[PDB]
Amino acid sequence: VDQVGVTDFTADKTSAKADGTEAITYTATVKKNGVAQANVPVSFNIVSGTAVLSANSANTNGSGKATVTLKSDKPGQVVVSAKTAEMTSALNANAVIFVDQTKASITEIKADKTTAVANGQDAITYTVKVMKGDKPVSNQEVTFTTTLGKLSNSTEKTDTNGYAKVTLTSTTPGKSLVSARVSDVAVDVKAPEVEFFT
Ligand SMILES: [Cl-]
Ligand SMILES: [Cl-]
Ligand SMILES: [Mg+2]
Ligand SMILES: [Mg+2]
Ligand SMILES: [Mg+2]
């Protein structure tokens, strides 16, 4: 309240080719008390992963929006953050993935919510997509693991649209990190962290 801050930091794509050429474009929105803030410097940082940012700091335009692009030559996951001076900590965007287009690779992992009740019933749903040649791959085995709770299954085969899904419940509270992988791709794909509460 009464502080300029990044309220949203999103990308136009969940994945791109690991050719160092295709760009993922991020948009940071900056508001104070819900009102767009113009001419505010937004600092961008690669929190984790291997990639290159086009800029490290850009000012918002007259709509309160500042953009930056990301490219990479390495298959993997990348987390980029955005911050304004008054924020205590940067806002992380959802991870994105750079893929070898010639190989069936996970291109996204999404959780339908980031919190749930720790009663063994309230389930968080994770959805992974697998693609090759920018097309979805069917019947690819995606294997899931977790640091907390019970997954509905360990391995699910992608459907005709490239998607595999599992649910996660927990009878005890805490943060949970779900990971996913496919064969022959050397990327430990991490889902957004979630948290269960009693
Ligand atoms: Cl996402
Ligand atoms: Cl459990
Ligand atoms: Mg989509
Ligand atoms: Mg693309
Ligand atoms: Mg439910």
Author numbering: 555 to 752
Please share text taken word for word from the publication where this structure appeared.
Intimin is a 94 kDa outer membrane protein, essential for the intimate attachment of bacterial cells to the host cell surface, followed by actin pedestal formation. Intimin is classified as an inverse autotransporter, a subclass of the type 5 secretion system that transports the C-terminal extracellular region or passenger through the lumen of the N-terminal β-barrel located in the outer membrane. The intimin passenger forms a rod-like extension consisting of four tandem bacterial immunoglobulin-like (Big) domains (subdomains D00–D0–D1–D2) capped by a C-terminal C-type lectin-like domain (D3). Here, we describe the crystal structures of the combined intimin domains D00–D0 and D0–D1 from the EPEC strain E2348/69 determined at 1.5 Å and 1.8 Å resolution, respectively.
